[PDB]
Design a protein around this ligand. Structure first.
Ligand SMILES: COC(=O)Nc1ccc(-c2cc([C@H](C[C@H]3CCCN(C(C)=O)C3)NC(=O)/C=C/c3cc(Cl)ccc3-n3cnnn3)nnc2Cl)cc1
Length: 238
């Protein structure tokens, strides 16, 4: 996160840190708890991930230093990638992780609500991007979960900023015209959380951008409201 501040413990209980154990264990991506055995993340996170057996999901974490050999985690049973996913820049950058065990909800870990299909028209005024990512292009993973309030940007305005790309309605952009606050390397997969009528909604999944927090270069997120039925299809399967 560029131009963000340290989070307080329990501020974002749906945020998880997805680790890989191959070749050595490290933070790979962010993710959001959306159900008791479901993590919603970005499909691009699994480039060269051949098996869910090398994945570890840590919930209820503020600081990466809370994670040692003896810290409990959730194993991943299945990685579900959207069928139309090719690359982050083309959209469909969404995936579900089906956990091996059930998440017990509490003050440190609980699910975030998906946006309402009816709320496709509502304008979110209080949106925050979170993660343990870099605070500039050439940096390292941050120990403390960072947060940054960012304004949403219209599709038309985002399309102007990304000449050469096709900014679809399955993407949602966020950023300041002057830059300074954004997601960066290590934040992808994580949430773009918007508070509307005292309830937080998972409005976006951190996906891509040209550099980090550059002026007139909004961050590009998967527009979660457009995948609610896809999510239900995979999580409510008979
Ligand atoms: C000790 O542990 C560690 O150091 N762990 C560690 C783990 C992963 C990384 C990491 C992650 C990423 C991921 C994609 C990759 C995610 C993992 C899988 N993958 C590939 C290519 O293997 C894609 N992208 C973002 O996080 C956000 C993009 C982004 C998003 C927005 Cl909205 C705006 C601007 C953005 N950006 C523009 N330019 N930069 N950002 N990219 N590079 C690196 Cl090196 C670095 C360190």
């Amino acid at each position: 996160i560029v131009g963000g501040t340290a989070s307080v413990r329990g501020e974002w209980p749906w945020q998880v840190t997805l680790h890989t154990t191959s070749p050595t264990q490290r933070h790979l991506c962010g993710g959001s708890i959306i159900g008791n055995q479901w993590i919603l993340t970005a499909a691009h996170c699994f480039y060269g991930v051949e098996s869910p057996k090398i994945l570890r999901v840590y919930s209820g974490i503020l600081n990466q230093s809370e994670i040692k050999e003896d810290t409990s985690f959730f194993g991943v049973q299945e990685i579900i990638i959207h069928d139309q996913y090719k690359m982050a820049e083309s959209g469909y950058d969404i995936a579900l992780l089906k956990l091996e065990t059930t998440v017990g909800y509490g003050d440190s870990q609980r699910p975030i609500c998906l946006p309402s299909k009816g709320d496709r028209n509502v304008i979110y005024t209080d949106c925050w991007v979170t993660g343990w990512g870099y605070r500039k292009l050439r940096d390292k993973i941050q120990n403390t979960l960072q947060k940054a309030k960012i304004p949403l940007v219209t599709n038309e305005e985002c399309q102007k900023r990304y000449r050469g790309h096709k900014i679809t309605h399955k993407m949602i952009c966020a950023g300041y015209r002057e830059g300074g606050k954004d997601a960066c390397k290590g934040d992808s997969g994580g949430p773009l959380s918007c508070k509307h009528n005292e309830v937080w909604h998972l409005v976006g999944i951190t996906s891509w951008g040209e550099g980090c927090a550059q002026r007139e270069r909004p961050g590009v997120y998967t527009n979660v409201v457009e995948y609610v039925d896809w999510i239900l299809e995979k999580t409510q399967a008979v």
